[PDB]
C-alpha cells in the first residue's frame, strides 16, 4: 500500500510514485476547513500538474487554525493529538489516524543500522504533547524492539536513572537529541561508567531535533566508543522527512512526501538547491498539508551518493545557519561548533556557549583543570585562523554550565501524602513531584 | 466467539468464576517455572503443575522482585518483550516489570473496563507519567484499543504545566481525563486561576478516571462536585500487575478475578483467604513475560464477596494502603483516611482542597489553604469535627492561597526549547545547554 526503499530504479520512477498520489492528496486537503476556505469561489487543484500552482502553507497558518482548522476527517477517526515545541503562547496542533501512524512509524524505522526484536531501545525524548517519544516508541513496537520509555524533561527520569538503565538493561539503541548524548556521557562518568568502554551492548545512537555538524556527530560517536550516531530530520507536523545513510548524509524520504526548496525573496520553489524546506506528505488523512514551509534553512542535492538509495540528500543549517556579524566576520553556530569539536577528544570539551556582540565573540566552555589553558589557546588560534573574529574565550570548571546535581541527583517517584509522622518531610504533601 | 480471554458476563456464579481461573493454572505454572526465579525456587524438589498444587504455592514478596532486578522474573526470550517499566517509590531499589504484545492486550482490556465507556467520540487527556512507569502507556493503550483520541498530557514533564493542560481541557473539548485524585484538584485550582469554573466551563468533560492514592468516598464525591457532578471513576493497580480492580456505577471497585486469582494475606497468622482484611496477593492468569505466583503487593485491603447493587458477580475491594496506618496521638488513633473524610466534609463553598497533617505524640498539626473570608469558619468547623470524631488535641492553621500550592504551578507557561549554543547579544544564553 505504501512504497519501500528499492521500489524505484530511477528519479523518473520516484517522480511517478509521487505524482500518482497527488489527486487523492489534493482531494483530501480540500476536506479541511483551511484549504476549503483557501479555494472557496474558485476551482481547486485536483490533478498532479495543478500541484505546480499550489500556494505554500506557512507555520503561521497552522497557528491561526488552532486547534482543528486543518482537520480533514471526523474526530472519531483520530488516534492521537500533539502540539509542537517552541512558543507555548501560540500552539501548533497536529493529529493522526491509525493509518497516518503506520506511515510515521515506517519512516522513523528507516535506520540503516536496523531496529530488530534483539534490540533494547531507550526512548529519551519527551512524551508530553510532542510526538517525538510516541514516534520512537511506535517504530520500536513496529519492529519488535523492547521499548524502555525514558521520556525527557520528566522529574521521574533524571540522567542518573537513565545511565543505570543504559548499563543494567544492556540497552542496544538510544533516541535523544545530540546535547542529551553528551549529557548522558557526563552522567555516565559521574556514575563511575566510561562511555567509550562500559556499555558493550550499545550498538547505535539515533538523534535529531538540533542542527548537527559532521565534526560534532563524529565526536559524539568517539565519546561512546566509535559506535554509529544515526541522524534523522523531522517535525511534529511532518514526522521523519530524512534519515542518514551508512556514509553519513541524510536522504529525503521522497517516496512518502514531495520535497521542494523555497526562496523566500523570489517566492520560487525548486526541487534542489539552498532555501527553506517545503513538504507535501503523501500518506496522511487527518491533517493534510500542501507545500508546508517548515522554514528550516536547508541545502538539497540530488547528487548520486555512495549508498545508492536513489534519493536526494539534505543538510539542515536551521537557526545554526543565521550569520551574526562580529567586526569584519560573519559567524554561524554551525561553524563555531566545528571549531569547538575539533579540539582533541582528551580535552573533554562538550559543553559550551557563545554570545555575538557587534565587536567580539564571547565564548565559555567546560574543561578539566590540567588541559583548560591548552583548550583556551587552541580554540583561540582556530578562531583566528578560520574566522578572524575578535573573541573573549573563558574555560570553566566542569559543574559550571552543567551542574553536578543534574548528572547525579536521584529522585524518588512519590505520590501525594497528607498525614505525616513527626520526623517526615511534609513539604512533599501536595507538591510531591 | 473468537476472543481468547474472558469478559464480564461469561460466568453466572462464583463456582463458574472459580473454574474459569482453575483451567488456566497448568499453563500459568508451566510458564512460571521458565523464569530463573521460580526454576531456582523449585530446584531439587517437585514443582507445582496442577490446580490442586496451587494451594501449596509460596508467596512472592516485593523484596523478591527487587532481588531479581532486572530480568530474574523473565520467562520468555527478550526478543518477545514489547515494553519495560519500573515502579514508583524508591529510585534506590528499582522494581522491573515487562510485557509481550499479548500481555499488553490483557493490560489494555482491564484498564478499558470503565463503566462510563471509552468510545471513538471521546478525547482522552492522559495526565499521568510516561517516564518508566506504566500508567501513561496503559491509559494510552486502552484509548487506542477503544478508538478514543489520546492527548498525551504526561505528568511531571516540564513540557506540560497545569496552565497548558487547562487550555487543552477547554479548547480541545476533552471528554475523559486520567490522573491521580490530587491532580484532579490541581487542575481545578489551575482552571480557577485561568478564570474558568470547573463546575460549568468544561461542558464536554463527561468522566474523570483516577487511581494511585487511597481515596475516600467523601473526597471522591467532592472531586465530582468540583467538576460539575460528573463521574469520578476509580481503579486500583500496580506496575507489576496492571489494573486489578475497577469502579462499578454504584461506586465500589470490583476485582478483575477473571484475569487473576486474588487472595488476602494476614501477616499475623500468615494465612491466605479469598476475602477479608489484610495484604493484597495476586496471581495474574494471562501473561507470558513476567509470571507471578501469589505476588504480595503488601497493600492493606478489605475484600468483600457481599453482593453490590451493580450485580457484576465479582468481589469488591477497598484499598486503605498507607492511609490506613494509625498514628497514636495519646489515646486516639488518627488515619489519613479519617482526617480526609473530615477535611472534605467542609462545605464546598469554603474551597478547602490542599492540606497536610503531622502526628506528634501529643498533638495533630494540620494546615490547609482557604480564601480569607472563609478561613476562620473552616479552622473552627474542622476543629469541631476532630473533637467530635477523634477527640485528638490539634493545632489547625488556615493558610493563604499560594502557600502550599504556589501560583506559578497553576499559571506559569513554559516554552519547549531545544539546545542553542550561539546567542545574539540581547538573548538569555542561560538556556544554551540547560534548556529544560
Ligand atoms: N536533524 C535535524 N537537524 C536540524 N534541525 C532539526 C533536525 N531535526 C529536527 N530539527 C528541527 O526541529 C524542528 C521540529 O520542531 P517540532 O515539530 O516543534 O518538534 C524542525 O523543523 C527543525 O527546525
Ligand atoms: N485506587 C487506589 N487506591 C489506593 N492505592 C492505590 C490505588 N491505585 C494504586 N494504588 C497504590 O499504588 C501502588 C502502585 O504502585 P506502583 O506500581 O509503584 O505504581 C499500589 O500498590 C497501591 O499502593
Ligand atoms: N525531539 C524533541 C522535541 O520535539 C522536543 C523536545 C526535545 C526533543 C528531543 O529530541 O529531545
Ligand atoms: N527530529 C524530529 C523527528 O525526526 C521526528 C519527529 C519530531 C522531531 C523533532 O525535531 O521534534
Ligand atoms: N499512576 C501514577 C504512578 O504509577 C506513579 C506516579 C504518579 C501516578 C499518577 O497517577 O499521577
Ligand atoms: N494505579 C495503577 C493502575 O490503576 C493501573 C496500573 C498501574 C498503576 C500504578 O499505580 O502503578
Ligand atoms: Mg477518536
Ligand atoms: Mg524485544
Ligand atoms: Mg508497585
Ligand atoms: Zn548515502
Ligand atoms: Zn458494584
Author numbering:
A (entry chain A): 4 to 436
B (entry chain B): 1 to 436
Text of the article:
We reconstituted the biosynthesis of the benzoxazole moiety found in nataxazole by adding two enzymes (NatL2, NatAM), to 3‐HAA, ATP, and Mg2+. We have determined the structures of both NatL2 (homologue of BomJ) and NatAM (homologue of BomN) from the antitumor nataxazole pathway. We show NatL2 catalyzes ester not, as previously reported, amide formation; the amide is a shunt product. NatAM catalyzes benzoxazole from this ester by a mechanism that we propose involves shuttling of protons to control the fate of a hemiorthoamide intermediate.
We soaked NatL2‐AMP crystals with 3‐HAA and obtained electron density for 3‐HAA and AMP. 3‐HAA (denoted as 3‐HAA1) binds almost identically to the molecule in the AMPPNP:3‐HAA complex. There is residual electron density suggesting that we could fit a second molecule of 3‐HAA (3‐HAA2) bound adjacent to the 3‐HAA1 molecule; the orientation suggested that the hydroxyl not the amine would attack the 3‐HAA1‐adenylate.
